[PDB]
Amino acid sequence: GEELFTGVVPILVELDGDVNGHKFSVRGEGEGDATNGKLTLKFICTTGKLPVPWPTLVTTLVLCFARYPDHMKQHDFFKSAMPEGYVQERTISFKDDGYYKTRAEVKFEGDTLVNRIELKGIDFKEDGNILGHKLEYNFNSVNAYITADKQKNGIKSNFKIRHNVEDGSVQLADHYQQNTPIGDGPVLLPDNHYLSTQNALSKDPNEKRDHMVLLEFVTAAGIT
């Protein structure tokens, strides 16, 4: 699928969300550049104010844009499943608070990479760090290990996200993740390795709707 990622690819992101009953929606657009492992996207909450902090939706809101070094192109399951795509599915468990369950299909719709997400949030404390909006507007870099899931012909990953709390503590969110291809072509089941993600969160001075401007770098590493 790498032939589809040699240049700048436009991105659409749509998420329908429900946490402790409140319904919100988010739409973003932007572009990826798997050559630099670079991602640029801006998201707006088209239902009003975001009921959760923006940094907790970042992982949910396109790993086919990772830069797989040329000596690791055979371990790039994400691009190999394209253009038919894959399902990305996660549990996100906020320590001492609620959890997210997310299901997304990531696929080429015409020439655009589309990521469409259903997110459900359950059992959150009305005064915890999530519904309380007590998290700093940033996102800590992480290295997440990828391993094949032969029984499902895809991959899995689990890792820890640490959100900074404003009071100087840390709000941990355990991520459990499974990817399986949508189509039936052969794909590349990878040797173990990891992806390194770094994210800069900003604001748009000329936007008065709830929004997030995101700059993401993703790189693969950990082979021979």
- The CATH C-level class name: Mainly Beta
CATH architecture assignment? Beta Barrel
Largest sheet: 11 strands, mixed, barrel
How many beta strands in the DSSP annotation?
11
**CATH homologous superfamily classification:** Green fluorescent protein
Considering DSSP H and I runs of 4 or more, what fraction of the residues is helical? Answer: under 10%
Quickly give the structural class.
mainly beta
Shape: globular
**Alpha carbon gap, first and last residue:** 22 Å
How many individual helices?
1
Using only C-alpha atoms, the radius of gyration works out to: 17 Å
Main sheet: which strands, in order across? 1-2-3-11-10-7-8-9-4-5-6
Element-by-element helix/strand order: EEEHEEEEEEEE
- Strand content is over 45%
Number of domains: 1
Pfam families: GFP (PF01353)
GO biological process, one term: generation of precursor metabolites and energy
Keywords: Chromophore, Luminescence, Photoprotein
Family: Belongs to the GFP family.
